[PDB]
Symmetry: C3
């Protein structure tokens, strides 16, 4: 199924008929960071499997729902579940849910995910406001927009220089200062590693030379589809480890260590993003 105007319209029509919510804000919350979705008010839960043209996710399994409702008086739509390119999903499968958000009326997309630290000053448990990116799949002919252009959504050649909205970054930092956790919040450049192997010790060292602050396997595909169709983005990384220090000390990482960092910061991140939603223009 192509992520075109007709197919995206069929999905939006179904959703409107079931929901009655017209959202202005979309959220994609990474694994371990989804507690806010369980607190959406007056909510409506729509399994992907019932939405016309949504991608098939039964090989990977696990949860897959669209959730609509209110947070802080604002109308929102959340993607509950993982759609990452290391799983083998195509460009068209990643793009269709974001283009459905557009047709439902979304103007701002908020994204969080766990990631590895490269900048030597980043500690486990820190937050990074993403201000730019280095897209290794995109340089290497695996950009999420490779294929025919869908002209109804955006231009053939998009400019990404303002993909990460500056005022949303400033609002997120202001709320951190108000609640006295600004010492946990950094800004930086995100490297997209297609994955699913963690960055190797020698890949990490290369990334430090190249001016990368954080590295991860998510986020950039959704950022590019959003930017192509005029949706503003705020993207935040939660740092699981410092991969440069781990390379110098010969220290390993596992899945239990990463998800324990999510558990440590889940409630603060939930509070932070509730206030952001409440306050954004």
């Amino acid at each position: 199924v192509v992520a075109n105007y007709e197919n995206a319209s069929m999905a939006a029509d179904y959703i409107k008929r079931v929901s009655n919510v017209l959202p202005d804000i979309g959220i994609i919350c990474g694994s371990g960071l989804g507690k806010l979705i369980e607190e959406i008010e007056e909510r409506k839960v729509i399994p992907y499997i019932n939405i016309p043209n949504f991608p098939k996710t039964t090989v990977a399994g696990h949860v897959g729902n669209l959730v609509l409702g209110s947070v802080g008086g604002r109308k929102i739509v959340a993607m509950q579940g993982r759609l990452h390119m290391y799983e083998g999903y195509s460009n068209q499968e990643i793009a269709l849910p974001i283009r459905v958000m557009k047709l439902l009326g979304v103007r701002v997309l908020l994204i969080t995910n766990l990631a590895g630290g490269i900048n030597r000053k980043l500690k486990s448990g820190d937050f990074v406001l993403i201000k730019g990116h280095i897209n290794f799949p995109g340089l290497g002919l695996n950009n999420v927009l490779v294929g025919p252009n869908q002209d109804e959504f955006g231009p053939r050649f998009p400019d990404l220089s303002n993909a990460y909205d500056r005022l949303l970054q400033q609002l997120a930092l202001k709320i951190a200062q108000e609640n006295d956790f600004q010492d946990l919040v950094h800004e930086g450049v995100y490297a997209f590693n297609g994955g699913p192997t963690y960055e190797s010790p020698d890949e990490s060292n290369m990334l430090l030379k190249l001016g990368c602050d954080v590295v991860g396997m998510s986020t950039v595909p959704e950022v590019i589809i959003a930017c192509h169709c005029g949706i503003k983005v705020l993207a935040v990384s939660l740092i699981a480890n410092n991969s440069i220090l781990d390379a110098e000390n010969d220290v390993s990482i596992n899945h239990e260590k990463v998800l324990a960092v999510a558990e440590k910061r889940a409630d603060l991140l939930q509070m932070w993003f509730k206030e952001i939603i409440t306050r954004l223009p």
Copy 2:
């Protein structure tokens, strides 16, 4: 359809039957830079759609013709239209037209395209003679030659150290000096960005660290197929903008700005390449 000896021969046989021209020189002219094709003498226009085994381009649409005739007393063949890998064309689709040129007798291929400037001394409207390249798709398992080797055309493992002919670069500069526009002409290393997003601000900064002078979304696939089968190449970039300066100043780019640079230089580039064709060995 595979870009093999049988399929390429069927296309060449059709072309010979219609044309009566045996060309020695091939040209691929980028968007906005094609006026020379409209001035080919005693010309014959063959739509791709009528040539056995030529790739299907109706999803992207727009023009798609092979044009044969004379320029400066030389016999040439031109590809009129865009075949770029960010559109989703396969390795086999890109390669077949170049291998047809080979079988028709082409010995020299000339290529022009718009591109982004990285070297700090490059200005909008400058020309760069390409002397080498950094192929990010090729390092990342999307080289145009991934697949079975077609042994009739070339070796399994090609050497690219002389892919950009030195004497053709010298002849192009000599003609610029004769016509007193040598101040617009530079040489440099081309980075292939698969695209279709322009290079991001932070990708541009990385490319400067890595010794790249220019970055673009074209040219390298055709260069590699030509080199594999023994065709000499001259490739020239027309600089649309300096992406390093634009990153430091927070300045954006759009499609209208890029094509306006093509309009500014189209007539000079046409004159330049007519003389090159006339004079090359």
Copy 3:
């Protein structure tokens, strides 16, 4: 055919029924470096084409056999033939033979291949013990593990920090010292170039900036599949040329030059790996 538990079990069952050997050690020997396989004792030769679910290799042609027997009193299994990703084989095709080795009981995998030198101190004919890697296909969304995870074999997100076993590297160097050829043996970081074009002059210069010591078109896919399923690895490069010196001197390379280096070192490498097999834990 997917490289899953069921399909790999069907292949292992066939092999056990024919062979009677339960191997502890696997070997993959690169082109020109396979003489040791012709000296396996009490050996049994199984063409890939007769093994359920093994990949089809008839387009590339040439040899394709699994060989089981004894070396130095140890029970081994060898892959005789080339399975490289520049040929167009899929992730699933590369992975299935390694996962069959796992099910047959292999605990250690030894790998050799020809490669290009980047570090300025590397000479034609030198050996490099690989201690880490930079996986350009993996950063660019062509990692060998992209796709659904096969949970019976390993985790969704593998850690590669100990992919190249330290004690096996130490044992290989110790044997070199015993036989007084330690002056030929270096250690270093391997860059994976998907290929099949050799690294260009300007790509080589980039790789030197990025801390790469050697560059090649093999090895890393097998390393990653082995690490995912708990197999220890020793990987050795035979240096064909120094690509940095060749770029500074404008010197080319061809297939006959590369294979002549293999001929020069084949007998010493055979002796070296026989002793390693005899002595490893």
